[PDB]
Amino acid sequence: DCIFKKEQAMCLEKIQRANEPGCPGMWDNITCWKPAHVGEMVLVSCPELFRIFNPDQDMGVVSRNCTEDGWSEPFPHYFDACGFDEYQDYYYLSVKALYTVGYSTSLVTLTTAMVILCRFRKLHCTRNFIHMNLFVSFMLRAISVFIKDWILYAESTVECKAVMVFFHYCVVSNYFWLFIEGLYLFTLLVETFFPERRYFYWYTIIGWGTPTVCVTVWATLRLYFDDTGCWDMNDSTALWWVIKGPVVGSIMVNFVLFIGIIVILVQKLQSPSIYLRLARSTLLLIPLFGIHYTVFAFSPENVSKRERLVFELGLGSFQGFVVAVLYCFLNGEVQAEIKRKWRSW
């Protein structure tokens, strides 16, 4: 037995004490009815359990009739006509397995890259520190995704709401650090003179604290107004947009900064082969700034959700692995340090 069946039992006592006949207030596994006159039509609305099928349209057209000693059954399908839809698992399961594999691979590769970066004292600069923070953001995202999947699906309690809040915080933090990468590179390219003004301190603050404000506001709003289930659904568009707005804003600003960096780079290249170099630089920059998020960022969630999720999850869960292999293992300085240490050993 589950809890949703107790709702019928919740109204069972209320109608059975009120009933005590024109027509007895009988109770079924669907609704709780009220007494009326013989042959009188009684109209009630199907409960919120039927609203999950049609969130967009709400209606409660359910009718019944009374007789001298009970109720007839002339509307058996009206329960299906109220909220039940008029007629996916493989797709959801395949996508789930796909991004679990991607997140696991990214986590392993990022752990290796982070260990390699931390173990060498030479590879200690502001750029590598920002890279380490980005790697930690991806690790937190992957861990939060695994925990959320295990809590919600594999196994509403207060613990699972905390898991949801932590998961949202990790995702927003990863997005903001993807934005911070581009912001820092753009600042370096533009304000070359007096470039270090403790920008690392402010960047760390904004990257690791801006998600905190948004998740706290969202959690407070959920607690006061919409505390339905384990906070894993986004029926209220405004409360979802509270989380979603900073993400898309970061994506668009990062795209603008990427365009500016490309402009500066192409100006450098054409100073008194160039297409190949520009293409290679752009291909290296795309995973670092998460440019692939711009494709579906402004499209509505309803419009082509299937391919949106498939792309941004199956091919978006390997972003951590790609940025780890591109910026740690394939880095020239890291390779030189590794070969020098191997020769020393």
Binding site: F4, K5, D28, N29, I30, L49, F50, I52, F53, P55, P76, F79, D80, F84, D85, Q88, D89, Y92, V95, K96, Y99, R141, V145, K148, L152, Y153, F167, H168, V171, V172, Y175, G229, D232, M233, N234, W240, I243, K244, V247, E301, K305, R308, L309, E312, L313, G316
Partner: peptide, 27 residues
């Protein structure tokens, strides 16, 4: 973001499946 959209869609799908099974069992 994509993770939230997928979680919402999958949770709604599971809820719909559970309610459909409940209605089939009781009716």
């Amino acid at each position: 973001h994509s993770d939230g959209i997928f979680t919402d869609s999958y949770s709604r799908y599971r809820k719909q499946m559970a309610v459909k099974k409940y209605l089939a069992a009781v009716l």
